[PDB]
Amino acid sequence: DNNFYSVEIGDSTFTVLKRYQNLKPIGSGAQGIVCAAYDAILERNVAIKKLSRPFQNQTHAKRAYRELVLMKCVNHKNIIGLLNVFTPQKSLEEFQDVYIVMELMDANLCQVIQMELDHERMSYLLYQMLCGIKHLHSAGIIHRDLKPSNIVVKSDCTLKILDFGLSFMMTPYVVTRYYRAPEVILGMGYKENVDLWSVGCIMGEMVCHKILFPGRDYIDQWNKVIEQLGTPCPEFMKKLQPTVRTYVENRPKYAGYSFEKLFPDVLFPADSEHNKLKASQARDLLSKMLVIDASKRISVDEALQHPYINVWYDPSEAEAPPPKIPEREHTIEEWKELIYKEVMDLE
Numbered sequence: 001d002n003n004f005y006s007v008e009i010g011d012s013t014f015t016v017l018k019r020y021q022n023l024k025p026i027g028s029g030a031q032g033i034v035c036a037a038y039d040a041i042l043e044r045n046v047a048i049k050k051l052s053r054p055f056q057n058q059t060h061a062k063r064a065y066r067e068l069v070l071m072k073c074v075n076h077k078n079i080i081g082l083l084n085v086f087t088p089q090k091s092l093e094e095f096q097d098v099y100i101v102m103e104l105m106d107a108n109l110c111q112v113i114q115m116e117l118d119h120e121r122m123s124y125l126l127y128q129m130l131c132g133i134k135h136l137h138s139a140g141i142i143h144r145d146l147k148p149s150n151i152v153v154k155s156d157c158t159l160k161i162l163d164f165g166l167s168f169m170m171t172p173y174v175v176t177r178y179y180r181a182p183e184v185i186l187g188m189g190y191k192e193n194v195d196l197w198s199v200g201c202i203m204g205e206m207v208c209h210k211i212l213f214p215g216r217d218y219i220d221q222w223n224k225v226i227e228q229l230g231t232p233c234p235e236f237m238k239k240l241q242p243t244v245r246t247y248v249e250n251r252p253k254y255a256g257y258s259f260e261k262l263f264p265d266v267l268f269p270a271d272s273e274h275n276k277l278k279a280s281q282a283r284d285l286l287s288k289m290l291v292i293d294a295s296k297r298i299s300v301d302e303a304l305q306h307p308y309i310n311v312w313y314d315p316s317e318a319e320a321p322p323p324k325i326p327e328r329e330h331t332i333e334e335w336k337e338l339i340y341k342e343v344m345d346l347e
């Protein structure tokens, strides 16, 4: 009660611990509004995300639960940490909302994408994304839904991934699918380098300042992919389920564009010999990530070692000890209790 106070943030009531002051909306996502606030105790700014009845359905519940668990057992500079978590409700019966408190970053990657970046900053951002992704992989977490809106940065070019990736809900909210790999689009099996496709899409967009494959649905998405990259080889076709294979084979054939035409020198710093070489290397990396057939696409480790990226390589960041994580299907009440226990640090 008196340890909390309430403020109206648009159509959301934020009921927060008194230590958190001067709340201001910084944006919204799949789980609602996120605010910046000042933590009067730590004497610094924080982000506060409100999860409103996260147990209301299985999609929300599994995400909230997985986020709480993973944020706690991961400690890596490129993965967002949990500073605090609380509920203003006093019991399991009364339990409604979860508030997740994290260190405040300066912007998301969507903002960075709207800016020209030199090779130093671009390569460093990419290196960090790759480090974060590899760390998740080392715990057996394959993201599958990496996107700019869930990646945040500081003015000093430091970067953190906010979510842990991969349905029906009764909401006007539309999930952005533009960064998802062909394996995901087409319902194939996948491995770790599924996430490299997403890095490729983000890198391409950082370079050309436009979404590479902005499809209204998976059918339109696939069209945009093959238009740009070309129809995949017969070898790839055999990897597909019969129903998917007939669909992919019956689409109009496209030649695709060379990576020189997709990403011309004009989109890169390319004045000096230094910059010309970097542009060539950047394009080479793009040509290895934006590869439809995952069996020919670069691995995370190969990307970390790539000449465009490896200038930043540090074993403490790229080869950190794997997180130790301590398939669930539950009802509303079951999820409610699981999430409450996790918030309250109960067994």
Ligand SMILES: COc1cc(CS(C)(=O)=O)ccc1Nc1nc(Nc2cccc(F)c2C(N)=O)c2cc[nH]c2n1
Pocket: 026, 027, 028, 029, 030, 032, 034, 036, 047, 049, 080, 102, 103, 104, 105, 106, 107, 108, 109, 110, 111, 149, 150, 152, 162
């Ligand atoms: C001033 O602070 C910002 C300002 C902006 C807007 S701009 C135009 O400057 O890029 C974007 C991000 C941030 N910073 C931020 N945004 C976050 N998270 C979010 C921020 C906005 C919306 C969201 F859905 C989230 C989320 N999913 O958690 C988080 C989560 C943990 N730390 C964060 N830091």
